[model samples]
Each structure stands twice: as structure tokens, then as C-alpha cells.
Target: SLIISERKEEGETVTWDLSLSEDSNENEKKAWKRYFERYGLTDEEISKIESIRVEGTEEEVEKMYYYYKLELEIREKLNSEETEEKLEEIWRLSSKGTEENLKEAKEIIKELLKEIGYKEDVEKKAEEYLEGLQKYLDYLSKKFGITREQLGKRETRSKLYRESLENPEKYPLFKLK
Candidate 1:
């Protein structure tokens, strides 16, 4: 029997005892495996969650169950976008090469690079590039506060640029001043 060790506050608080006979130990894990699978957990996720000694109130468990479900949405979104493969190809094609090779590589990746959204066209005027970057800089400075130290971190700005590029509609580019 699965022991309901304690109950209180009209079942708001409860404890389940895990003590089990040798024959039932495997059955207990099998049951939990089904529960995790029913919630769309991957095998690795199921193993990680089951390895932990999980205990919580009904409300806490309900909240955790939904949290795991939200993770599934994020995983699906990343997979659908083929984000990892696109990033890998970008790195692979960026290696040094002759003019012909570089042109071929650029032709192959032009569409993918354009999806980066926040870019200055190389063929365009240098002043256009300057204007675009300046607008982005001012936008970031205003949004995050106009602090020199905060704005000076190039890597931070790089990430923000990529994030904005990834979802430009959500994180719109600033217009030229």
C-alpha cells in the first residue's frame, strides 16, 4: 500500500511515505515514470526529477508541474527556429579564405545573416552604418540609463543586439536621430 503518512488542514498538507517492499520498489518507479511521461517529460528530464527526493504541498506541486510544462514550450520554440544549426553554420563559414571562397560563403549565408535583422548593409554608405549604430546606442543608453560604464561593455551590447535581432518585431530597432 502507498502510505499516506499524514494529512492536515482538510488535506491541504499531506505527506507520502516512500517505504516499500522489495517487490513493490520497481513498481513505484514504474508508476512515477508513467506520471512524468503523461506530462510530456523527456527521459532525461524524468530521470533528473525522479532522482530528487521531492516533497511539497499540493499547491507547490501544482506550480512545479506547470513550470515543467513551460520548459516544453521553450524547447519547442528553439527547435522550430533551428537556432543551433544556424549558429553553427555562421561560425563554420566565417573562417578566413580567398576572395572567391569568401564570396561563395557569403552567398550561401546571406539570407541567414539578414535574419540577424540589426545589420548595416556593407554596400550602403558608411554614414548609414554610423546612423544605425548611433541610434541603437542612444536607445540602449536611455533604456538602461545613460551610464558610461554600463554602455561601454561591448559584449553586453552584442548580446542585446543579437536578442533584438532574433525578435526584431518584439524589440524594435530605434529610428535614426
Candidate 2:
């Protein structure tokens, strides 16, 4: 006699079919408050953005607008006076945008971010900051024969001291006399 086969199902069934949704609608953009909530933002802390106007003279605004336009940067990202110039314009803009302009832009960004309750993502950003600080400290130590601590007591490092790290070959330790 032929035996009858005792059957079973081939595979387990998924609770939901995730292959594709019946609805192909895009997500709506939520408020910045909702976005910041994921990063532990609170409503009360974000209330500092009372005034949207930035305090600056007409000349400052014109300069910032010029930088923003030339750089083709969004206004938000144009928080600093420094413009990301094309290689050809680097020399020309470098003359106009001195250390002062860079400092001002950074200050503006800091203030604007603070007003919006934006905090630095130190959890990851701190790594690069620490690395740069290490290099600066190392350079100061070697040139002045003093640790960064001692150099900090003085207002400024001499040009020679600053230039010592400019070229690897120019450094004293590199040459075996």
C-alpha cells in the first residue's frame, strides 16, 4: 500500500509585509523642536530665540551677504564671515578676509547657535579639536623649548617659533648634525 504524506507549511509567515508599502507618501517635515527632541532638547531651553534679527551695521551685512553669495552657501551655514573661495580667488579674498573677519564670523555663529539652543555635538566633534590642540602645543613646545603652559604666560609666540613647524625639514630635530 502507498503511504500518505504528512504535510507541513514551507516557511514562516511575517507579521507584516515590509517589502513595500501600499502608500508611497513622503514624510512631512517636522518643526525644529521635534527634530531636537531626538537629541534631548527641551521646550523651555529653546525659548531663547526671541529675536530673529542679527545685530550688525549695514557694512557688516553687506560684507556677510557678499561672502555668502560668492561662496554659494546657505544663509544658515554662512554663520561666519569666512567664505569658501575657489582656488583662483583665494589670494584675492585672503587679503580682504583677515583673521579678524574669521573671528567675527565664528563669534556670530556661536551667538546664533546659542540663541537657537543649539549645542555643539561634543561627543564626536571633540576629537578633531583635541588633535589640533595637540599639534599646536607640540609646535610651541619644540620651538620655545618650553611647554605650552609656559608659552601661554606670554601674549604671543614669535614668528620664528610659529614658523618652526611650517616645514618638517626646517625643524631642528629633523637634521642630524
Candidate 3:
């Protein structure tokens, strides 16, 4: 949902609620670790991010992960002198906090995201993930002789689909796309 807006608008950074709590689970922690690892973050760098124990819905955690993944990938691939110069310009413009300045910085950030293949590849991957979920859901609906809506209403059906995703051998009919 956040990806629908390609970049953060002026004033958005102040209100964005990416807070952390102390009781995060392994999956949430893994999301952070995998993201940091991809960008080859140092342990010192990771400790700063890892120290953040976030409290949010699973979907919120996923959204935060997606945003940081894109940001870090951008940071990793574009860490050249030219990009740094561009970023410095952006930072200067952003600091001005005027509508025109914010607009200019946003334009640069959007172009940079495009250059880094953020929208192109991530959208495709998102679609493929949804398709895989559908395939598994279809198998479950047929296996249980229930409509898709009915399957959705049943917790057992949901658990079965989740289990099938985790261990495909356990539910041979459920194939990922």
C-alpha cells in the first residue's frame, strides 16, 4: 500500500509511524537481518537497526521491511560520488522545506528509484507472490469442497494453506506459481 506512493512527500517523514517495541518475533527480526545483510551492513550498522524492537501489526512490519529494503538497496547500489552529489543537492533542497524545493527533491528521489529498478522488479515480484498465494488457495478450496470465500471464513482452511506453503510436500495439490 505504501508503495502506491513512490516516494515520501514533504511533511510525511514527521508523521510516519515506524516505531519499534521490545517484543518482536523471530520472523520480524529475520526480516530486518535479511534486509541489512543484502546491503552488506556491518555489525555496528546492524546493531543500530536491530536494537529497534518494533510494535506493530504483521502487515505494518512487512510494510516497514519493504520500505527499508528499497531504501537500503538504493543506498547500496548508488553509493558513488555522483549519486552522493545528487543526494547532497536533494538534502539541501529538502532542508529548505518549501513546496518547490520538496517537489524537486521528490523528483530526484523518484528518478533514482526508477533507475534502481524498484518499481519495475518489485511490482513483478509482488504479482508473482499473489499468484502463488492464489494457486495454493485454489487447491485448498477444491480439496475442502468449499468456495474460496468459505475457505477464507474457516481458520482450519487458512492454517492448511499456510502449512502447505511452509511444506509443499505435506499438501501435494498446493503448487506455488
Candidate 4:
């Protein structure tokens, strides 16, 4: 149940209690006028109560509200990290690439490069690889008389690029940086 400040106008020392339960959605995010409008508190009187709660009480429940609010914020942050980690684990375990997985890998590579202070170097390498691989993949499809739709995803392209780099004899036309 949402409780309101009981201190009268021009009086200080306002306090209230809230019961916590498993079904608490608005625990810290207590809707003041929402609670007011729910029961029968007039909006005018609610406005008056709002004014008192700000100026009348030096030790108002704002701190308590902020405490619970921060807890929820931290929980949300941890949850976000956990979800991302699960996605990354799947990416690591699977080398087969879809467009979504390729996009995920691109994002993660950017972040890792930034963290390792090789952002510029890695970016240059990416540009070189993309330039060479784009032409090479294009040639492979056209020369083999395959449609553009038959081209493999980023992982396959990346694997061939690596192989070309390792043994330039097989893929003599691929440019390197």
C-alpha cells in the first residue's frame, strides 16, 4: 500500500511506511498523485501535500525513495550485463555466422579494439580486409557463375581472407595491408 506524509501544513516531521512484497512494481517509484487519484484525494489537496513534503520536512522520505530506486537501477544494470554475456557465449561457441551474429561480432570487435587501445590500427586492418575481401568475394561469385544471393556470410569471407593472407599463392590477387 502507498502511504502519504501525515504532517499537517506549517508542521515538520513527516514520515510514512511501505510494505514490501513479491508483487511490488512501484515500490520506490511511488506515484504520488496516482495514489491520490486512486483513493479520493483531490488534485488540489495533492498539490498542497506536494508543497509541504518539499519544504516542511528537512528529513523527508526522499532519501529512502532514492535508496530503493538506486537498488533497482543497479539490479537492472547487472541484468543487462548478464544478458549480453549470454549472447557473447553463444557467439563464441558457434563459428557459423548469420547476419545477426556477424553484426554482433562486429560490435564486439569494435569494443575490444577500443579497450586494447588498438582502435585505429584495427580499423585500418578492417578497411584493408573489407576492400580486398569485397572484390575477392565478388570475383568468386561472378567467376563461378553464381548469383549474388549465393555468397556466404562474414565468417566465411573472413576465413577465406585469413587463408589468403596465410598463403598468398592460392589467392594471389587479394590485397594485404
Candidate 5:
């Protein structure tokens, strides 16, 4: 996806290479040709495979296109979260999906992340609830005769919850949450 490649050759000679075809497929190379034309190269000049210089250096062009893709990839991650809300809309659009709906979804989800996708705060709370359930289960298996298979079942969970609830002498950890 990147054009400018930084390579440290022998004796620490740093080189930046312009790679136009790194990501472009056959059809998309026309987009690259149009993109180069934006840098003030003619259709005639770009037609020939010659080393042509333009308003921007290849290094600077690489720097900008690299960041151009960098920002989109972040939007790509946020875009997946928004898709959960619009699964049917995306499914129905087998005809045409375009620029407006796609870009709006990404930006909306990026703004939504601050309030909802607060990773650390919400995740730790779920961990505690899961740990508490396991804590009571571990308390049962250690004292009583329940093993791994019994703990795996919804059938055995309620059975053992009542089983250990009765025996105060055998099971010390009682009065379940």
C-alpha cells in the first residue's frame, strides 16, 4: 500500500524508492495515472515509461499517500462497529454502494467511540462478574465432588447450586450471590 520504501543499504546508505505499482491492480492503475496527472504530469508524458519529475518529489508524494491510507484504515476499524447497526441496509444494497453512505458510517462510529467503546472501564466489570461465577464454582468443586464436565453444563449448574446450598458442614462458601 506504501510507495516510499526506506532501505539502509551497505555502509548505511539510505534510499527512498518510488513504487507506483505496489498496490494498483490492472484497472486501478488508471486511477494512479489520473493521480499522477494531479501532480501535473501530462497524459502524453505518463504514457511513456520515463522518469518524470513533477511539482512534488516522489518522497513527499509517498509521505502523503502513506498517511492517506493510514487514516482510512482507522476508519475501516470503526466502520465494522457501525455495520452492526446497518446490516440490513448493506445487505439490500446489492445494486450500488457508494461514497456517501460509506463515509458517513465511518465518521459516525468514530465520534460514537468516546462514550460507548471505552474499552478498559467496561471490560473489567465483565471480568469481575465472570470471576465471581467461577469463584463460587471453584469453591464447590474443591469441597464437594463436582468435576470439569459437571461445571460445563447448565443442567448441572443449578443442581450443584442447590446441592452445596444445603450442606453447610461440607461446603463452607454458602449464601450465594
Candidate 6:
């Protein structure tokens, strides 16, 4: 099934298209609303989302919800025009295909993730995010005459511009939006 991705856009309305819910979408629908509401989504926006999904037994459903719940938490916590603009700039610099720009862009993304409610493993998450966009890296790497794996290792490992997302006490910062 086509589940939500790191970059969900318009027309690709995030839906709960589980194999078990073939006959009706209402069961998963309510479960999603309850989950979204529980996680900080307002009823008004909830009505507008129209789709987010799951598939399987209660245990399976809980697992899927836990997973997506974190993703939705990211969205809910960081939903701001400035956030979008920052991400867009990340993409913009990424598209520039320059190592310097890419490095700076990544710095901003990491710094942004440091703020807001306590979510650990932001680096791992964004690493997966960058891994998921291998195509972008693929093209950029090719443009620089190298393989993607090498480019990825270098791009993320340079270690000079890295900023600590940790709090003053040396922990990843966390505060509710």
C-alpha cells in the first residue's frame, strides 16, 4: 500500500489504505482521528486531513500507530511556515549540488530538529531521510564524478559544521510546541 513518506505533498492525501480495511474505511478513520487528536491535531484540521491509515490485528495496528504517531508528532510539532521555508531552503541548497551548500543546509535541518518536544535520534531520522532521497544524492554525486555511497559518507561525516542539538545540560532539547 502507498503509505505516507517523509515528504508528503498535495494530491497525495495521506490515507489509511490497509489491506484489512478493503470493505470500509470508517474503522481506521476513527482510529486515526482519535490518534491525531490525542497527539495534538485539532478537530478542524483533522476533518481536513481525510486520510492516514493502518492494516492488521489490534497488535499490528498499535505497532503501526506507534510508528506513524512519531512521524505525525514531527509534523504537528514543527508545523509552521518558517519550518516549511527552512525545509524548502534545505532542498534548494541540496539542489544546488555544492558540498558547501549541502553542508550548511544539513546544519539547519539538524538545528531545527533539536528544538520542540523531546524526540531522540533526530540524526538517525534525518540520516534515513537523506538515505531515502538517494536519487538526489545520486545525481549530485554523479555530477561530481563519484558514487552515491562515497558521496553520502563524505557529506554526512565531514564533522566540522556540526551543531549540538542538546540542551545546556547536554541533552537533545524538548519542549511542546
- TM-score per candidate: 0.21, 0.24, 0.33, 0.24, 0.26, 0.36
The sequence of per-residue lDDT tens digits that candidate 4 reaches over residues 45-83 is: 334332112111333344433332322332333334443
- Residues 1-177, model 2: lDDT tens digits: 011112222343111101112232222112222222323334553332221111123333333323322222222233323321221123222223446633444444344334434456522222222232334344435544654444433233333322333433454311111
lDDT leaderboard ranking: 3, 6, 4, 5, 1, 2
RMSD of each: 21.2, 25.8, 19.1, 28.5, 28.3, 17.0
Model 5 backbone overlap count: 0
**Top TM-score prediction, candidate number:** 6
Summarize candidate 5's per-residue lDDT along 1-177 as a digit string, tens digits: 324433324342222333344554553445444433433445664464222111123443334344333323323343443433442232122112245643443343334333345345534432332233233334345445667435544445445434434453454323221
What's the lDDT for all of these models?
A: 0.36, 0.30, 0.44, 0.38, 0.37, 0.42
lDDT of 3: 0.44
Candidate 5 all-Cα RMSD: 28.3
Q: List the residue pairs that clash in candidate 3.
A: 20-53, 20-54, 21-53, 21-54
Q: Report the number of clashing residue pairs per model.
A: 0, 0, 4, 0, 0, 3
Candidate 5 runs further than 4 Å off: 1-120, 173-177
Stronger candidate by lDDT (4 vs 5): 4
Off by over 4 Å in 6: 1-73, 116-120, 134-177
Put down candidate 3 lDDT per residue, 24-124, tens digits, no spaces.
44444544444334334454544543121212334433444454444445555665557655654554454344578656766676666767775656444
Prediction 3 TM-score vs. true: 0.33
Model 1 TM-score?
A: 0.21
**Tens-digit lDDT track for model 1 on 1-177?**
232222334354422222222444554545544433433445654454312111346544333333223222222333333643442333233232235533544453444434443246633322232223233334345444444234444354445444444454444321111
The TM-score measured for candidate 6 stands at 0.36
